[PDB]
Amino acid sequence: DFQRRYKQFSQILKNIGENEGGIDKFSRGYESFGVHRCADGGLYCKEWAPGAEGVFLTGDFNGWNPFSYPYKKLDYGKWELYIPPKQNKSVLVPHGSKLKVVITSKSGEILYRISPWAKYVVREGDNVNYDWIHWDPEHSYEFKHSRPKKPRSLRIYESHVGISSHEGKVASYKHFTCNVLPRIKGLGYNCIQLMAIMEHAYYASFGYQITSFFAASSRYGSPEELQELVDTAHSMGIIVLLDVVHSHASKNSADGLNMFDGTDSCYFHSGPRGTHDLWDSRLFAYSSWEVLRFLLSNIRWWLEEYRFDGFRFDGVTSMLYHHHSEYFGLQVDEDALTYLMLANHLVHTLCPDSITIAEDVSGMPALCSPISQGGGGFDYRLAMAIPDKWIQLLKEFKDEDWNMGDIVYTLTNRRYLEKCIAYAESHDQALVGDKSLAFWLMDAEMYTNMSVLTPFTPVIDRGIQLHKMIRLITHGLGGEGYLNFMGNEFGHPEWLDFPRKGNNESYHYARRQFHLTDDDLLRYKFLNNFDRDMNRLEERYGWLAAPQAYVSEKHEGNKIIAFERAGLLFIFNFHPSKSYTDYRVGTALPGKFKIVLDSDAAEYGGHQRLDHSTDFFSEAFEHNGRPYSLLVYIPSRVALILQNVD
Numbered sequence: 010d011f012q013r014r015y016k017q018f019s020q021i022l023k024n025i026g027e028n029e030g031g032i033d034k035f036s037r038g039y040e041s042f043g044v045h046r047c048a049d050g051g052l053y054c055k056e057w058a059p060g061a062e063g064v065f066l067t068g069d070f071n072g073w074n075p076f077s078y079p080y081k082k083l084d085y086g087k088w089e090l091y092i093p094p095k096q097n098k099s100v101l102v103p104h105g106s107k108l109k110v111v112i113t114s115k116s117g118e119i120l121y122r123i124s125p126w127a128k129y130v131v132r133e134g135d136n137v138n139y140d141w142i143h144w145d146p147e148h149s150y151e152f153k154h155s156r157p158k159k160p161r162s163l164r165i166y167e168s169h170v171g172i173s174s175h176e177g178k179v180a181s182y183k184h185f186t187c188n189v190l191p192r193i194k195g196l197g198y199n200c201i202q203l204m205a206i207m208e209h210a211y212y213a214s215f216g217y218q219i220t221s222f223f224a225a226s227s228r229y230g231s232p233e234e235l236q237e238l239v240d241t242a243h244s245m246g247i248i249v250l251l252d253v254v255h256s257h258a259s260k261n262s263a264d265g266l267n268m269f270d271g272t273d274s275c276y277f278h279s280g281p282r283g284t285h286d287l288w289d290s291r292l293f294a295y296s297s298w299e300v301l302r303f304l305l306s307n308i309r310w311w312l313e314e315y316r317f318d319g320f321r322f323d324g325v326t327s328m329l330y331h332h333h334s335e336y337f338g339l340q341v342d343e344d345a346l347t348y349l350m351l352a353n354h355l356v357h358t359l360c361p362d363s364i365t366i367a368e369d370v371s372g373m374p375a376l377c378s379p380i381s382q383g384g385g386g387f388d389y390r391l392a393m394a395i396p397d398k399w400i401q402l403l404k405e406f407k408d409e410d411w412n413m414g415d416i417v418y419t420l421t422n423r424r425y426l427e428k429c430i431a432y433a434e435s436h437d438q439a440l441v442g443d444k445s446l447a448f449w450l451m452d453a454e455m456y457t458n459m460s461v462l463t464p465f466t467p468v469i470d471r472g473i474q475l476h477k478m479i480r481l482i483t484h485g486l487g488g489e490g491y492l493n494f495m496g497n498e499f500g501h502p503e504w505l506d507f508p509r510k511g512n513n514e515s516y517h518y519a520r521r522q523f524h525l526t527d528d529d530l531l532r533y534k535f536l537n538n539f540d541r542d543m544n545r546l547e548e549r550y551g552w553l554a555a556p557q558a559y560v561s562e563k564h565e566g567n568k569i570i571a572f573e574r575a576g577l578l579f580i581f582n583f584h585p586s587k588s589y590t591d592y593r594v595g596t597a598l599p600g601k602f603k604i605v606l607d608s609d610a611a612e613y614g615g616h617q618r619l620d621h622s623t624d625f626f627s628e629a630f631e632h633n634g635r636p637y638s639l640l641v642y643i644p645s646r647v648a649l650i651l652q653n654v655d
């Protein structure tokens with residue numbers, strides 16, 4: 010029940026007001042928790058560690074003396090320490106040097122921890138654990154550019170910084186900034202979804218095993234270099250979203266958030282409930298006031314310090330249903346959902362133009378509706394049914410048996426007030442044990458016939474053609490936003506895989522062969538050219554922000570799908586062999602229609618059969634529930650977008 014959820018949110022928010030002075034003040038914990046050089050040269054420190062017997066600071070700066078700097082036990086399980094400034098006015102904890110919090114347990118155990126609030130952590134050489142590096146650089150980065158105007162419609166480039174080069178190594182923030190952003194802009198994307206930024210010790214977790222929640226991952230470079238990346242993306246008109254992983258945490262205790270104060274509670278729930286058996290991860294105790302301070306402050310942190318334009322919250326389904334659309338009727342974890350409501354509230358009160366996206370597979374209603382209505386407050390959900398339908402079709406059905414009605418139903422079956430992000434394939438489908446669309450479509454011929462020096466075989470023909478069309482149907486019909494994972498826009502060959510046991514720390518597939526699209530002797534350029542033109546076209550006409558399409562034809566015999574959105578006329582011939590010569594298509598208004606996009610074009614790897622100068626007229630002639638009709642010529646496996654120029 011939604012009246013209850015909102016009464017509950019309102020009560021917790023009211024308390025944050027009466028006890029912490031508002032959610033703004035509340036979410037600024039990072040200003041005192043942690044380690045801070047003060048303006049007077051001393052060092053102020055603070056932790057939450059309710060099960061600790063004692064808390065201490067140690068590191069290079071004091072010769073790893075475990076107990077010479079003990080914190081004072083405060084009310085509510087918190088601890089604070091202030092080291093006086095040195096008489097000789099020199100720095101107490103030098104920039105770049107190592108620290109550790111020391112926790113003494115009820116058992117008399119001596120624990121070494123990285124601060125839950127740590128800015129920066131580095132793994133040195135062949136070491137097992139991460140070190141906590143004090144970060145007090147001489148020159149902080151000054152942001153020089155303002156937020157881009159809020160985009161009418163989101164065209165999202167899903168990105169991972171480490172793999173963004175052709176080299177089998179962890180690529181850098183700097184590399185990304187100089188060499189990848191310009192590419193993302195050139196393609197017509199107006200938003201970047203930045204994966205794997207929150208610190209994670211295990212690279213092959215694809216960024217999902219968080220060890221330090223406030224740390225910009227050190228893999229790629231320094232905190233300053235991330236800021237520059239974000240600042241630079243803004244200068245180019247591109248907005249940047251962060252993957253927020255607040256659904257679970259790595260079981261690491263040496264350099265992770267687990268067992269911080271020697272307990273299995275603290276930031277997490279005690280008992281089996283507080284562990285995620287399949288992910289082997291800890292689960293936050295969202296009911297706990299300090300866990301709300303931590304997570305909400307984390308959101309504020311990413312907003313203020315790195316100037317992100319929004320967030321995608323990963324693992325929302327687990328947050329709601331970990332205890333357990335066959336999801337109707339299940340009991341939701343209202344603690345988790347209240348946190349998400351508070352998060353969204355915070356993000357949108359600080360800036361209404363900020364964007365949040367939920368990764369939720371359950372399709373729970375009201376996740377994307379207003380908080381005042383008992384909803385989660387997300388702007389967007391990912392449309393996860395769509396990648397499934399393409400996989401199903403390609404795996405289980407000859408082309409002659411594809412159902413247009415099923416395709417139209419899956420892409421348009423949406424809740425009217427929920428904006429969602431449509432994409433044709435996920436980052437998960439790009440991984441080792443899986444198949445990409447390009448590979449589903451082309452299998453082994455992807456390694457033999459992607460060169461313009463080889464025959465344009467029927468396999469490669471079909472592959473090139475369907476790749477474009479699947480993307481375009483998804484892009485025009487599927488949602489209120491589009492997403493594309495790094496490389497899939499030009500049909501990147503092979504697969505993605507990270508260094509791990511299973512491959513002897515191989516970086517060989519941990520990269521992106523971006524050069525493939527710059528090679529004129531290869532055929533990737535075709536897929537790439539189409540992507541760029543697809544996005545520039547939407548930028549001009551704005552079909553993502555338009556109401557749902559009016560589907561005029563979902564014809565199973567001819568395999569034709571035709572619809573209107575934002576006034577444009579979309580026509581798909583999915584037939585594996587037949588082409589159509591005087592094919593009548595319904596239209597809303599009469600007049601002269603012209604091709605504005607044609608997948609048969611040569612620059613797209615098409616067959617170049619259409620004359621774009623031919624005028625298409627729709628006269629008053631009723632067809633398929635439309636008051637007007639035009640006649641078009643449309644080949645097998647071609648998509649057309651026609652505009653009314655009257």
Ligand SMILES: C[C@H]1O[C@H](O[C@H]2[C@H](O)[C@@H](O)[C@@H](O[C@H]3[C@H](O)[C@@H](O)[C@@H](O)O[C@@H]3CO)O[C@@H]2CO)[C@H](O)[C@@H](O)[C@@H]1N[C@H]1C=C(CO)[C@@H](O)[C@H](O)[C@H]1O
Binds near residue numbers: 027059085086
């Ligand atoms: C409302 C209050 O909740 C939180 O405080 C709790 C701690 O987080 C818990 O870990 C737990 O720790 C300590 C025991 O309460 C205490 O009896 C003692 O045995 O030490 C325990 C650990 O060694 O319990 C705390 C109370 O549930 C939260 O951290 C705290 O900030 C919250 N306090 C707010 C309320 C008021 C008055 O309305 C103000 O005085 C505070 O400034 C607020 O922060």
